[PDB]
Structure 1
Amino acid sequence: GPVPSRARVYTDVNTHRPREYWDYESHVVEWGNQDDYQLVRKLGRGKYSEVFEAINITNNEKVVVKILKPVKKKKIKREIKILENLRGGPNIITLADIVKDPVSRTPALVFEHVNNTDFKQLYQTLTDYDIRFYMYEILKALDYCHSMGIMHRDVKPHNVMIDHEHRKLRLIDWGLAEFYHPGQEYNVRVASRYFKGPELLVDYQMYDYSLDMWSLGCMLASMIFRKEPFFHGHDNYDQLVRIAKVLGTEDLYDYIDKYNIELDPRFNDILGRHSRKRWERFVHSENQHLVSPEALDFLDKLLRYDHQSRLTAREAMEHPYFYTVVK
């Protein structure tokens, strides 16, 4: 069958942690006082939850409350344990409390509030320096969670909350995050379409932290080229075709051949043959001020078919692209 794969870094972080650390199913939730929190306004909802702005009446501080929909019980403790494991880490959203909602009869997670600017509006205004600055901040969060044996699996602009006033960033929504264990096969139905790594799109289950680095590359491409999203597929199959029109089909076949993976035969009549493109193809007068040789090389090293070939978060932070960012 498929050739096995291992993360090239933080491979055995969880094997050497106490079982309590990664065995989220055995986690016992510590419950706070639901009366401490008053809901103020609904912010939105996902397939799995509804999110509200709220107020902590013990300190009159703004917080966010995420009421988990009664769906997929298993996922509850997983998200909670991951949040508790990562609490205090650089640019990780802080879980402030966990309470039982009396209406939904499900857990409600209480998070720190970030005074963010919607990415749709924000990406339009980011300068070159801003993109480098915020990329570096995202990498701090990703190197941290990876070093702690966790992959996020849903890196995308919505989940990177940025307070542009105080230049503060938080990686949110760890609802899809998982513990990395060498040799483990994972669900490929993770991440948002435009940010799904080639591993997911070719149904390769033995993936790792490097999935997040593909997603980061997709964000970077959208920012420096001012095209959001960058790979704009109409479904999961067209998504891979869009990628192959840029990275080329020969390197896609090299990738699947390396892992002895077969494409879904439905690609037979949609994939075609495509050359690899040079990144300069995507530069034009309206985005050129965001582009530099350093940006393109960094991007090039994130967006590899082979998850094993991508920059790690730590390697990424060493890139010349970040030399100009004040440390």
Structure 2
Amino acid sequence: RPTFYRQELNKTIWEVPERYQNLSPVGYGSVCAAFDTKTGHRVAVKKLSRPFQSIIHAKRTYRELRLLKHMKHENVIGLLDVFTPARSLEEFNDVYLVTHLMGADLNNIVQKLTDDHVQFLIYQILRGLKYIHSADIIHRDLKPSNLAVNEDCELKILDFGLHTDDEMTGYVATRWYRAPEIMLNWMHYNQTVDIWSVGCIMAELLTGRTLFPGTDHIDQLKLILRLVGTPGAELLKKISSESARNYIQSLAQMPKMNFANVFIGANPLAVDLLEKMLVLDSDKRITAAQALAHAYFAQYHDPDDEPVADPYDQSFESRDLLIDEWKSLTYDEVISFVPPP
């Protein structure tokens, strides 16, 4: 067990191992930047706020720790350390998570981007997604502010979806990248919702403009259906709510637009890929593994260097436990953590 030291920074007590120095507040928890003297990296240290206050919060704390401990891929955020100052389960109350400190996100770039930049950035998102989806994990919240990018144009996916009603209302970027079947609760969704988000991000890199900046859910749906067309009978059969089906059928029918006349002057191979991502019926969207083999990425695709994940057991999600049982499971995962090389 390392030696810990305590200090108050901006109304909160931080008790951390000596290896972490020069803590500086930066921003579910509070975050400080710090220098990790054991590894030489600048890191983000997050102190979770009230991690075990309710059953829902205790289970969410466990879910986040299990997910971050599993993610080991060049294009996905990983866990550098996790610690508690508690010496026993009986006094266990606080959880601290340590990751690499991220500078710019895709917004702080979306600069002057060549087609070669768009190829490389979208390739890396799909490479990370192939890995995430191979573990039957759905990210659910892909958008430019959840993508870290450095000076060398290298990219990492972060901030997995572990959002409320008010957060999704009105003219808000939190909703502009969401697939329509989850925005309006049409059906049980699956990993294909993430590919819809990649399509929205790719279109924005190519044009410099948000693809579907709706002023509310309904305005956004109208923008979407004007581009991709209104649904046919095949998709309508898959929407569970009779009211939602009734609303769809109240709209005048529209054909799918010509994407070459929307994305004027774009690489024809980029146009072709966008048509395969932005498909209304989620069953028919291209998958991440299929998209990596698309000719738009010929310059970067290497099927021997696009790895999949170890199997991931999510059976805990259907388990009904008490607060102190979720807390003990979390404690076990903190003390069994093994750092990366």
Shared fold per TM-score greater than 0.5: yes
Contact 1:90 1:144 survives alignment (8 Å): no
Deviation at 1:96, TM superposition (A): 0.6
Q: Which residue of 1 aligns with 2:256?
A: 276
In the alignment, the residues of structure 2 paired with residue 238 and residue 221 of structure 1 have an alpha-carbon distance, to the nearest angstrom, of 19
Q: Does 1:82 align with 2:67?
A: yes
Deviation at 1:321, TM superposition (A): 0.9
Q: Which residue of 2 aligns with 1:128?
A: 115
1:151-170 matched pairs, under 5 angstroms: 151-163=138-150, 165-170=151-156
Deviation at 1:262, TM superposition (A): 3.5
Q: Which residue of 2 aligns with 1:73?
A: 58
Counterpart of 1:172 in structure 2: which amino acid?
A: L
Matching residue within 75, 95, 98 for 1:91:
75
Contact 1:34 1:100 survives alignment (8 Å): no
Contact 2:212 2:220 survives alignment (8 Å): yes
Matching residue within 14, 36, 42 for 2:19:
36
In the alignment, the residues of structure 2 paired with residue 222 and residue 67 of structure 1 have an alpha-carbon distance, to the nearest angstrom, of 34
Q: Which residue of 1 aligns with 2:38?
A: 58
Contact 1:201 1:237 survives alignment (8 Å): no
In the alignment, the residues of structure 1 paired with residue 194 and residue 270 of structure 2 have an alpha-carbon distance, to the nearest angstrom, of 18
In the alignment, the residues of structure 1 paired with residue 47 and residue 112 of structure 2 have an alpha-carbon distance, to the nearest angstrom, of 32
1:278-293 matched pairs, under 5 angstroms: 278-284=258-264, 288=265, 291-293=266-268
1:229-240 matched pairs, under 5 angstroms: 229-240=210-221
Q: Does 1:174 align with 2:160?
A: yes
Q: Could you say if the C-alpha distance between residues 293 and 95 of structure 1 is closer, same or farther in structure 2, counting changes exceeding 3 Å?
A: same
In the alignment, the residues of structure 1 paired with residue 270 and residue 240 of structure 2 have an alpha-carbon distance, to the nearest angstrom, of 33
Matching residue within 220, 235, 239 for 2:202:
220
Contact 1:101 1:108 survives alignment (8 Å): no
Contact 2:175 2:183 survives alignment (8 Å): no
Counterpart of 2:33 in structure 1: which amino acid?
A: E
C-alpha offsets along residues 37-95 of structure 1, whole Å, 9 cap, x if unaligned? 34644443xxx334332222434420012333336332111111111112x22311121
Contact 2:214 2:220 survives alignment (8 Å): yes
Deviation at 1:169, TM superposition (A): 1.4
Matching residue within 78, 82, 96 for 1:108:
96
Unpaired runs of at least 5, structure 2: 1-14, 52-56, 87-92, 303-341
What's the C-alpha RMSD, in Å, of the aligned pairs? Answer: 3.2
In the alignment, the residues of structure 2 paired with residue 300 and residue 39 of structure 1 have an alpha-carbon distance, to the nearest angstrom, of 49
In the alignment, the residues of structure 1 paired with residue 22 and residue 187 of structure 2 have an alpha-carbon distance, to the nearest angstrom, of 40
Q: Which residue of 2 aligns with 1:198?
A: 180
C-alpha offsets along residues 178-217 of structure 1, whole Å, 9 cap, x if unaligned? xxxxxxxxx9x99930111122023135221111111111
Runs (4 or more) in structure 1 with deviation over 6 Å come to none
Counterpart of 2:199 in structure 1: which amino acid?
A: G
In the alignment, the residues of structure 1 paired with residue 26 and residue 177 of structure 2 have an alpha-carbon distance, to the nearest angstrom, of 23
Deviation at 1:109, TM superposition (A): 1.4
> Which has the higher mean CA deviation after the structures are superposed, 124-133 or 68-77?
68-77
Counterpart of 2:61 in structure 1: which amino acid?
A: I
Q: Could you say if the C-alpha distance between residues 265 and 301 of structure 1 is closer, same or farther in structure 2, counting changes exceeding 3 Å?
A: closer
Contact 1:241 1:270 survives alignment (8 Å): no
Deviation at 1:254, TM superposition (A): 4.5
Q: Could you say if the C-alpha distance between residues 262 and 162 of structure 1 is closer, same or farther in structure 2, counting changes exceeding 3 Å?
A: farther
Q: Which residue of 2 aligns with 1:311?
A: 286
Unpaired runs of at least 5, structure 1: 1-31, 178-186
In the alignment, the residues of structure 2 paired with residue 134 and residue 158 of structure 1 have an alpha-carbon distance, to the nearest angstrom, of 14
Deviation at 1:34, TM superposition (A): 4.2
Contact 1:237 1:267 survives alignment (8 Å): no
Other structure's SS at 1:258 match: coil
Other structure's SS at 1:249 match: coil
Larger radius of gyration: 2
Counterpart of 2:257 in structure 1: which amino acid?
A: K
Count of aligned residue pairs for this structure pair: 271
Other structure's SS at 2:109 match: helix
In the alignment, the residues of structure 2 paired with residue 175 and residue 49 of structure 1 have an alpha-carbon distance, to the nearest angstrom, of 15
1:13-24 matched pairs, under 5 angstroms: none
Matching residue within 141, 144, 151 for 2:131:
144
- Give the TM-score normalised by the residue count of structure 2: 0.70
Contact 1:202 1:263 survives alignment (8 Å): no
Q: Which residue of 2 aligns with 1:184?
A: none
Q: Could you say if the C-alpha distance between residues 279 and 106 of structure 1 is closer, same or farther in structure 2, counting changes exceeding 3 Å?
A: farther
Q: Could you say if the C-alpha distance between residues 159 and 100 of structure 1 is closer, same or farther in structure 2, counting changes exceeding 3 Å?
A: same
